Amino acid sequence: AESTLGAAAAQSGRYFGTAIASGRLSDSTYTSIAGREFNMVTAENEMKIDATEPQRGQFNFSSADRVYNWAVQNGKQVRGHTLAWHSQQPGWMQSLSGSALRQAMIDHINGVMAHYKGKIVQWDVVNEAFADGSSGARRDSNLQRSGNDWIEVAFRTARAADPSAKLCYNDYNVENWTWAKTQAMYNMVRDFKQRGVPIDCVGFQSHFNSGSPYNSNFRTTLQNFAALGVDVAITELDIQGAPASTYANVTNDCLAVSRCLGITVWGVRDSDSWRSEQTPLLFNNDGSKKAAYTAVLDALNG
Numbered sequence: 267a268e269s270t271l272g273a274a275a276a277q278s279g280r281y282f283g284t285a286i287a288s289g290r291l292s293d294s295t296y297t298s299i300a301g302r303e304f305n306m307v308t309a310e311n312e313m314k315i316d317a318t319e320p321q322r323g324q325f326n327f328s329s330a331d332r333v334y335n336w337a338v339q340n341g342k343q344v345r346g347h348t349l350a351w352h353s354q355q356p357g358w359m360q361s362l363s364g365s366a367l368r369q370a371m372i373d374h375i376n377g378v379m380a381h382y383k384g385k386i387v388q389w390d391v392v393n394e395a396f397a398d399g400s401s402g403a404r405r406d407s408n409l410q411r412s413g414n415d416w417i418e419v420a421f422r423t424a425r426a427a428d429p430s431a432k433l434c435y436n437d438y439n440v441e442n443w444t445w446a447k448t449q450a451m452y453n454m455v456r457d458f459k460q461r462g463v464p465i466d467c468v469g470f471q472s473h474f475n476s477g478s479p480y481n482s483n484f485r486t487t488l489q490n491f492a493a494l495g496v497d498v499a500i501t502e503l504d505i506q507g508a509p510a511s512t513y514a515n516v517t518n519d520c521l522a523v524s525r526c527l528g529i530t531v532w533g534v535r536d537s538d539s540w541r542s543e544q545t546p547l548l549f550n551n552d553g554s555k556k557a558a559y560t561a562v563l564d565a566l567n568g
């Protein structure tokens with residue numbers, strides 16, 4: 267067996283990753299534990315639109331490169347996050363609509379992807395485009411108001427910008443097979459595959475909690491999306507209370523699906539999370555391993 271999460275995941279050809287924040291990189295406990303345990307990194311905030319293009323046409327990759335460089339220096343691959351999203355847009359992009367916004371969205375994808383061309387294994391090209399609830403509608407945003415084709419255009423733009431990256435659609439509350447949101451995403455991906463839209467992967471955020479609880483049918487969700495001809499990935503995992511049983515279940519669901527590339531938990535210690543009050547991660551505040559860590563490692567080791 268293997269003694270760390272990333273190495274244990276690698277025995278089945280998968281990765282075990284985390285979100286990394288540039289502001290925490292002077293914390294020796296964080297950097298040593300993150301370096302030891304994970305083989306995949308996602309920048310927590312540094313590769314988002316506001317951080318990378320603070321003013322139109324004026325890119326700033328300083329903080330993003332700090333995360334990227336840390337990952338490569340520590341032997342990890344990197345998931346880019348995220349190129350088109352309604353949340354966290356810089357004010358200059360919030361003022362744009364229609365065709366002007368479309369051009370800025372395209373320019374933003376091209377500029378960020380060119381900087382990291384051939385260096386990023388997966389990109390979350392589009393994030394959180396569906397509304398929550400029973401409707402299955404697209405979320406309202408300046409991007410969605412520019413037309414239903416905004417998502418497809420982002421994907422076609424990204425494929426041309428860097429043909430070596432796996433292009434993913436990412437979202438939350440899409441893990442339970444029976445939910446309307448899950449079905450809306452499923453039909454979009456099915457449609458994309460029939461029309462030749464270049465989508466290679468689907469990211470399941472996996473923010474499990476009392477209001478959006480884990481269900482055993484997540485495995486069915488993963489299998490059904492994989493059958494559409496896309497890879498699947500667990501991208502921002504955290505579970506309220508960090509129950510060992512649920513952490514083991516999610517891990518085993520990924521291990522049972524051949525195209526489940528790996529799992530990323532959203533943070534290292536409970537105190538590093540935005541949801542620290544629900545103590546939803548695998549390491550305690552002092553860096554020690556909880557019960558959930560042991561369960562995940564055991565599952566990865568079979």
Ligand SMILES: *[C@H]1O[C@H](CO)[C@@H](O[C@@H]2O[C@H](CO)[C@@H](O)[C@H](O)[C@H]2O)[C@H](O)[C@H]1F
Nearest residue numbers: 310311314348353354393471502532540
């Ligand atoms: C999935 O959910 C995580 C947690 O909400 C998002 O990461 C958070 O993003 C916000 C907004 O940019 C930040 O304030 C938090 O520090 C960060 O943890 C992630 O982007 C999203 F895809």
